[PDB]
Swiss-Prot record, chain A:
Ubiquitously expressed. It is found in: Cytoplasm, Cytoskeleton, Microtubule organizing center, Centrosome. This is Gamma-tubulin complex component 2. It is linked to Cortical dysplasia, complex, with other brain malformations 15: An autosomal recessive disorder characterized by global developmental delay, variably impaired intellectual development, speech delay, facial dysmorphism, microcephaly, and varying degrees of cortical malformations including pachygyria, thin corpus callosum and subcortical band heterotopia. Most patients have generalized seizures. Belongs to the TUBGCP family. Component of the gamma-tubulin ring complex (gTuRC) consisting of TUBGCP2, TUBGCP3, TUBGCP4, TUBGCP5 and TUBGCP6 and gamma-tubulin TUBG1 or TUBG2. TUBGCP2, TUBGCP3, TUBGCP4, TUBGCP5 and TUBGCP6 assemble in a 5:5:2:1:1 stoichiometry; each is associated with a gamma-tubulin, thereby arranging 14 gamma-tubulins in a helical manner. Gamma-tubulin at the first position is blocked by TUBGCP3 at the last position, allowing 13 protafilaments to grow into a microtubule. It comes from Homo sapiens.
From Swiss-Prot, chain C:
Changing G131S: In CSMH; somatic variant. This is Actin, cytoplasmic 1. The modification Tele-methylhistidine is found at H58. Changing G131D: In CSMH; somatic variant. It comes from Homo sapiens. The gene is ACTB. SUPFAM superfamilies: Actin-like ATPase domain. The lineage of its organism: Eukaryota, Metazoa, Chordata, Craniata, Vertebrata. It is an enzyme of class 3 (hydrolase). InterPro entries: Actin, Actin/actin-like_CS, Actin_CS, ATPase_NBD. Keywords: Acetylation, ATP-binding, Cytoplasm, Cytoskeleton, Deafness, Disease variant, Dystonia, Hydrolase, Intellectual disability, Isopeptide bond, Methylation, Nucleotide-binding, Nucleus, Oxidation, Ubl conjugation. There is a cross-link at E251 ((Microbial infection) Isoglutamyl lysine isopeptide (Glu-Lys) (interchain with K-50)). Pfam families: Actin. It is found in: Cytoplasm, Cytoskeleton; Nucleus.
From Swiss-Prot, chain F:
Ubiquitously expressed. It comes from Homo sapiens (Human). Component of the gamma-tubulin ring complex (gTuRC) which mediates microtubule nucleation. The gTuRC regulates the minus-end nucleation of alpha-beta tubulin heterodimers that grow into microtubule protafilaments, a critical step in centrosome duplication and spindle formation. It is found in: Cytoplasm, Cytoskeleton, Microtubule organizing center, Centrosome. Belongs to the TUBGCP family. Component of the gamma-tubulin ring complex (gTuRC) consisting of TUBGCP2, TUBGCP3, TUBGCP4, TUBGCP5 and TUBGCP6 and gamma-tubulin TUBG1 or TUBG2. TUBGCP2, TUBGCP3, TUBGCP4, TUBGCP5 and TUBGCP6 assemble in a 5:5:2:1:1 stoichiometry; each is associated with a gamma-tubulin, thereby arranging 14 gamma-tubulins in a helical manner. Gamma-tubulin at the first position is blocked by TUBGCP3 at the last position, allowing 13 protafilaments to grow into a microtubule. This is Gamma-tubulin complex component 3. The gene is TUBGCP3.
Swiss-Prot record, chain G:
The gene is MZT1. Its main location: cytoplasm. The keyword Transcription regulation does not apply. Associates with the gamma-tubulin ring complex (gTuRC) consisting of TUBGCP2, TUBGCP3, TUBGCP4, TUBGCP5 and TUBGCP6 and gamma-tubulin TUBG1 or TUBG2; within the complex, interacts with TUBGCP3 and TUBGCP6 to form a luminal bridge with actin that stabilizes the initial structure during complex assembly. Interacts with TUBG1. It is found in: Cytoplasm, Cytoskeleton, Microtubule organizing center, Centrosome; Cytoplasm, Cytoskeleton, Spindle. Keywords: Acetylation, Cytoplasm, Cytoskeleton. It comes from the Eukaryota. Belongs to the MOZART1 family. GO terms for biological process: gamma-tubulin complex localization; microtubule nucleation by interphase microtubule organizing center; mitotic spindle assembly. It comes from Homo sapiens (Human). This is Mitotic-spindle organizing protein 1. The chain holds residues 11 to 75 of 82 of the full protein. The lineage of its organism: Eukaryota, Metazoa, Chordata, Craniata, Vertebrata. One of its GO terms (cellular component) is centrosome. Required for the recruitment and the assembly of the gamma-tubulin ring complex (gTuRC) at the centrosome. The gTuRC regulates the minus-end nucleation of alpha-beta tubulin heterodimers that grow into microtubule protafilaments, a critical step in centrosome duplication and spindle formation.
Length: 93, 59, 354, 90, 123, 171, 65
């Protein structure tokens, strides 16, 4: 029943990992919701929100798997946030 | 030139479609550009038939 | 896993057979105080307090004591493996003395206790990486045009040119200094970077010189401490030395040397002309393939079909060729085993690694 | 592939040289492959005798009758009508 | 050229370890490329295949294969690589094999030992 | 009434043609264990009616537009396949039972659940306003539905991208 | 063995008789070309079509000479 509950969460997470709530001057656009935090990404609750936020101020202008005691996904997020800024910061200089 | 090398690449798909070769559009541009390097095509006939062979052992 | 170790005059590349790229690359240097021995990047980083040695300065091993240290470093520091637990494929320069081949073999089996090993010519591995067994191939840091037929290098037709990346770096320092800047100190590292990033081979030297003399269209900026400098005709004048060594006071260019073909049997020359492969860091200059095509065409018969192959991954094609070879089913029977070494001794390398 | 050997026998060339003719030979042979008339070696025989008699060569008209029987004697030829229909035309 | 063999090995890899298979399939690409290297015009080889087209019918298609190689002249080594690699009665015989290959693929599972075709019972 | 007789009529109720008669297909004897499974199975055929009436009522009037055709002519390629399944199921009736049908027809109980609820959300929409109401069915996440409707959109939005590559006009 | 050498004899005979019928009819063919036209006619091929080809390639080899 640990192979099963890994087959569900592997499929019940593809929609989430293909898109933090948005709104409609820029600190009220996207804001963290505190309840719905996985409590194993709580360490990086600020780099996720900061990673996509930089992608939108440029867009409107013009794989992850869960493992225990292994942080292959915690490292995978830092490898994209370290690029999310290098495209926007360079976009303003 | 990229307009010409697109047409010449588009015609070449059909003669590979009626000859019943399994090469789709992506693997064709890979093999065309690789043959464009200068590799001998008599060998490429063996790697594709073997890559497709070891691929079947998985399924 | 089998290991693949490419011994370079300037940089060594090491990794595991089967991989698409080397796991580590480091300077072929060993340093001792002016921790007793420093190897690789560390030796370079702390060169200020060390006396550096280059045991394979021009592709051929000249000091086996330090070469042994480079190999020790490769296994234990870079790859973090025990050599006695993995077969090892090593690379060697073209025209490597027979005695050196035996020495390398003896060191692997007796000093590192490798379970198996093999040695292949660098140029041959690069040709393999391009999917060929016949053709003419290598410009690195400290030093070849190597005709290969059916997997075998033809020693009688191999030519060595003591002109490579190192000479080009120093030449760039010289002409940038003549421009009004000043690059003279071991600044050499900075210029090496400028060279690798902004240089290119002009299709026509004179026309390019005329363009640079009458406009700023070929100028590029490079930032150092913040100072931004300008590199003009130096961009292409630097690598031009490969085609005209006289710029360096040397008496043939790479196109003319690629003479090697003419030294081969007339029956295979067309195969070489149609399969001239570039390899090595110094062949990375943008525009070099088209320039070679033009120059060779001028030297060869008008009826000859000329083709220059410049793989995007040619900087590491030697290592990649080794990864491919060591992974081949038919190559497994070719390794020299510890058993075979115990049976025949170091000289077995001549028969096993022909 | 066999039609291309023919174009190299009649015209003395290599297959890389003569390719306009071989383009014309595939046009005629192809789309005209199936035999159009009922096959019988009897009728084609009585027309090679009638032809060698018409040339006052009455001696070879009775020699062919002895060479046409040997073809049946050995028995390695499946379609004997075709090869005679062709030898008569040329 | 060292990369064009790496992109080729990706296309033929069927989508889903996808990180080590590419490392092992690049061996099969090299282990097979150097076997031929260790060991005739171009347009003629098409006509010999144009002939075999017209024999079994489908004339106009064969008149098309020659129509393109005539305009591809105004590259030769590329076509040398490609050559290496009742209308109603067939309809009623296709939609009948489907109903033979649809009731079979599911009756072979519906009637068997309990738990053979089921993947969750194999856990 | 034998179980085989029920398997004979059900293969018709899957189409609209009625023991089982015509909103639930009330069946009218037999044991309770049989009537219950027929009821659910018979009701799947009723759905097929709601999707057939639309592609027949709107295939009549000529004032439905150019988009309303590529939609009404894309609800048919997703029905011939439902006519291929009924082909296969009938060849085996000559063995399959009720409990064997449930697994056979468990998937086409969903495709005939989205399509029979995709033609009600867009009832009076003609022109582009219909290609905008079959796109409000893609925000669903369900990997089986979002990959079905995102195909009907690729047919319905072909006429719209035909005017564009060539917005209310006034005569 | 033997039955593989008895067939090579019964073919050199027939290929020698067909060369006699070929000369009394004055076809321009020779022993090499005639062995190609015989093989073709064994597989089954219209001699009204094959002879139009030979009557053409021989009609074009003169425009080049």
């Amino acid at each position: 029943a640990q192979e099963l509950c890994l087959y569900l969460t592997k499929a019940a997470s593809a929609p989430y990992f293909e898109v933090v709530e948005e709104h409609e001057y820029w600190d009220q656009r996207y804001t963290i919701v505190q309840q719905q935090i996985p409590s194993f990404l709580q360490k990086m609750a600020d780099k996720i929100l900061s990673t996509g936020k930089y992608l939108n101020v440029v867009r409107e202008c013009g794989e992850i798997i869960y493992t225990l005691k292994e942080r292959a996904y915690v490292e995978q997020i830092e490898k994209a946030f370290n690029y999310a800024s290098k495209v926007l910061l360079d976009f303003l200089m | 030139n990229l307009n010409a090398v697109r047409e010449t690449m588009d015609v070449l798909l059909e003669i590979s479609r009626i000859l019943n070769t399994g090469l789709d559009m992506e693997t064709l541009s890979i093999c065309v550009r690789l043959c464009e390097q200068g590799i001998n095509p008599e060998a490429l006939s063996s790697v594709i038939k073997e890559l497709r062979k070891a691929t079947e052992a998985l399924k | 896993a089998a290991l693949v170790v490419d011994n370079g005059s300037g940089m060594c590349k090491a990794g595991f057979a089967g991989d698409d790229a080397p796991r580590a690359v480091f300077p072929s240097i060993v340093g001792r105080p002016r921790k007793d021995s420093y190897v690789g990047d560390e030796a370079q980083s702390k060169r200020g307090i060390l006396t550096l040695k280059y045991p394979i300065e021009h592709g051929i091993v000249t000091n086996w004591d330090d070469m042994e240290k480079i190999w020790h470093h490769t296994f234990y520091n870079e790859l973090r493996v025990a050599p006695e637990e993995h077969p090892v494929l090593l690379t060697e320069a073209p025209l490597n003395p027979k005695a050196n081949r035996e020495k390398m073999t003896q060191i692997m089996f007796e000093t590192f206790n490798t379970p198996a090993m093999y040695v292949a010519i660098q140029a041959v591995l690069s040709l393999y990486a391009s999917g060929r067994t016949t053709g003419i191939v290598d410009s690195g840091d400290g030093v070849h045009t190597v005709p290969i037929y059916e997997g075998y290098a033809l020693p009688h037709a191999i030519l060595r040119l003591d002109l490579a990346g190192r000479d080009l770096t120093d030449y760039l320092m010289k002409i940038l200094t003549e421009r009004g800047y000043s690059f003279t100190t071991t600044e050499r590292e900075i210029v090496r970077d400028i060279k690798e990033k902004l240089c290119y081979v002009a299709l026509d030297f004179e026309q390019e010189m005329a363009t640079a003399a009458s406009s700023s269209s070929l100028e590029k900026s490079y930032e150092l401490d913040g100072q931004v400098i300008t590199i003009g005709n130096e961009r292409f004048r630097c690598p031009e030395a490969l085609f005209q060594p006289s710029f360096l006071g040397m008496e043939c260019g790479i196109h003319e040397t690629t003479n090697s073909i003419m030294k081969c049997d007339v029956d295979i020359r067309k195969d070489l002309y149609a399969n001239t492969v570039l390899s090595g860091g110094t062949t990375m200059y943008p525009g070099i393939a088209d320039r070679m095509q033009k120059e060779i065409t001028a030297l060869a018969p008008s009826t000859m079909k000329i083709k220059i192959i410049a793989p995007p991954e040619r900087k590491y094609s030697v290592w990649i060729g080794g990864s491919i070879l060591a992974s081949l089913s038919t190559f497994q029977q070719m390794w020299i085993s510890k058993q075979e070494y115990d049976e025949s001794g170091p000289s077995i390398v001549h028969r096993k690694c022909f | 592939v066999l039609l291309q050997n023919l174009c190299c026998r009649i015209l003395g060339r290599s297959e890389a040289d003569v390719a306009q003719q071989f383009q014309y030979a595939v046009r005629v042979i192809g789309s005209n492959f199936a035999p159009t008339v009922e096959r019988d070696e009897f009728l084609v025989a009585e027309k090679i005798k009638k032809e060698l008699i018409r040339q006052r060569r009455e001696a070879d008209a009775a020699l062919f009758s002895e060479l046409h029987r040997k073809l049946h004697s050995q028995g390695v030829l499946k379609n004997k009508w075709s090869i005679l229909y062709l030898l008569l035309s040329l | 050229i060292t990369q064009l063999f790496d992109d080729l090995c990706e296309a033929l890899l069927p989508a889903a370890n996808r990180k080590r298979a590419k490392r092992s399939l690049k061996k099969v690409a090299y282990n097979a490329l150097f076997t031929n290297l260790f060991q005739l015009p171009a347009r003629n080889k098409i006509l010999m295949l144009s002939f075999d087209l017209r024999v079994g019918g489908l004339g106009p298609k064969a008149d098309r294969l020659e129509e393109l190689v005539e305009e591809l002249e105004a590259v030769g080594s590329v076509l040398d690589l490609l050559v290496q690699l009742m209308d109603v009665q067939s309809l009623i015989s296709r939609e009948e094999c489907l109903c033979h290959s649809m009731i079979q693929e599911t009756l072979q599972v519906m009637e068997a030992a309990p738990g053979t075709g089921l993947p969750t019972v194999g856990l | 009434i034998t179980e085989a007789a029920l398997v004979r009529d059900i293969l018709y109720v899957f189409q609209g043609i009625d023991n089982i008669k015509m909103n639930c297909y009330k069946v009218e004897n037999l044991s309770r264990s049989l009537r219950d499974t027929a009821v659910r199975l018979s009701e799947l055929g009723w759905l097929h009616n709601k999707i057939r009436r639309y592609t027949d009522q709107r295939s009549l009037d000529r004032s439905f537009g150019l988009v309303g055709q590529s939609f009404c002519a894309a609800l048919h390629q997703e029905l011939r396949e439902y006519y291929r399944l009924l082909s296969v199921l009938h060849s085996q009736l000559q063995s399959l039972t009720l409990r064997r049908l449930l697994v056979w027809t468990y998937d086409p109980k969903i495709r005939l659940k989205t399509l029979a609820a995709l033609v009600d959300h867009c009832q009076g929409r003609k022109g582009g306003e219909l290609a905008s109401a079959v796109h409000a069915y893609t925000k669903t996440g369900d990997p089986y539905m979002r990959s079905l409707v995102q195909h009907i959109l690729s047919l319905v939005s072909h006429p719209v991208l035909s005017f564009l590559y060539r917005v209310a006009s006034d005569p």
